[model samples]
Target: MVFERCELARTLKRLGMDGYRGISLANWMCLAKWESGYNTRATNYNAGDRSTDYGIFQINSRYWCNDGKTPGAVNACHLSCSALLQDNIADAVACAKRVVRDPQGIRAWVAWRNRCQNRDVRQYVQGCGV
Candidate 1:
């Protein structure tokens, strides 16, 4: 499901993502844009290692999700990776909260490190009224 930027912002804010785990909503918005272009069904397969990233957050199957095919998968969220690929994001949000609580924090997301980290991303939510 495609989400308008403002709609996504409002929904994310309603989910209390703005200040959750010390990460800003704008940063999350930026991360989402870069990671999956706000596409819930997004998935990335690493040819080098055969690992996969799933959903809008691109949560890695190697650690956070279980595809049942990734060897040594940790399944930290105790969720099926496919569950995150749906339009509804409640499960994704819950799993992401767990990710942020890890010692790595938001840095667990490579897109955030490359695109959102230390960058001024206020414009991601500008005029959203969230």
Candidate 2:
């Protein structure tokens, strides 16, 4: 989709990294584009709608980013690169890493490999250095 050089793309690469175990750049980019179009400040148009999800990954506002007391909780204000990318890329990368680590991730990737229209492409584009 010619997404290279985009701010969100750069952010993803800088923080999340490209080649890591189960964390393929293509997969990560696809998911991020699907979820939020790389909009760190993006929120659901229907703010009070029952199905509204917000943030870059479109995580549910109430469930994922509503931790009010704990330090480093991923609230809406802290979702930006300025806030989350301060010490490290931990904020942005954590969710993608979680997906990679989950059993469902592996199963999903296998399903993608089996069902995707293009079978010629390498499934594991990233060599899983991590």
Candidate 3:
């Protein structure tokens, strides 16, 4: 599911992503835009680490999800990689919420740093009615 910008904002708000852990809805939208383009089935294979980043949040197999291939992998989210690729996004969102609980918080995603941090991100949700 490749979500339209405002549509994603509304959906995420409904799922309680807005102001989660002090991160604004626009920030989440910005992270998704750069991480996965709001596409639920997105994936990126990291050859050097032998890990894969899966779904809209790009949760990594090396430490977040279990792909059964990453060396020294930890299933912190306690879920399979396939769960992150579903159209529903419920599983993906849950794991994403967990990821933010770390000290790094939203900085867990480098995409968020490069794209959203200190930037005016409200443009992502301004018209979404979120």
Candidate 4:
């Protein structure tokens, strides 16, 4: 049931036409895989603590969902809200598109990955160098 909601692939398609528009699908897929393992409700487990990143896009609860943007919005609870608020993937794609459009290049992604509790994930995005 949860797996069926994994819209990473669909999200990519919408992004291809919306945000990415002309970017390579291969690149999008790579980012998706690294973000949420293609799972809609995927949450990270860090030893005994829980992570704030959630959903197929791994949106941060503090920045995106909380602050009253979404209700019942705990770190993990707002994942679905984050995904749905995107206006059915198109808006989500648009958000990412805006991020990539920054002059910072992939540093945007680098910053996101770094914000996570998982250092290994950050290393993977940074060419696997720890």
The model with the greatest TM-score is 3
Write model 3 residue lDDT over 81-107, tens digit each, in one string: 999999998898899999999999999
The residue-by-residue lDDT of candidate 2 on 9-79, one tens digit each, is 45666675576664556555555555555555555633444434444555543323443433344443334
Question: Which candidate, 1 or 2, would have the higher lDDT against the true structure?
Answer: 1
lDDT tens readout by residue for model 4, 58-115: 5545433443443344532333434633324554455556446656533455534454
**lDDT-based ranking, best first?**
3, 1, 2, 4
Lowest summed lDDT window (length 10), candidate 1: 1-10
Clash counts for the predictions, in order = 0, 1, 0, 0
Cα lDDT tens digits, model 1, 1-130, are 7678889899899888999999989988998899889889999998877789998889999898899888888999999999999999889999999999999999988878889888889999999998
Off by over 4 Å in 1: none
The model with the greatest lDDT is 3
User: Where is the poorest 10-residue window by lDDT in model 4?
Assistant: 121-130
Task: Name the TM-score of candidate 2.
Answer: 0.48
Ranking by TM-score: 3, 1, 2, 4
Model 1 C-alpha RMSD to native:
0.8
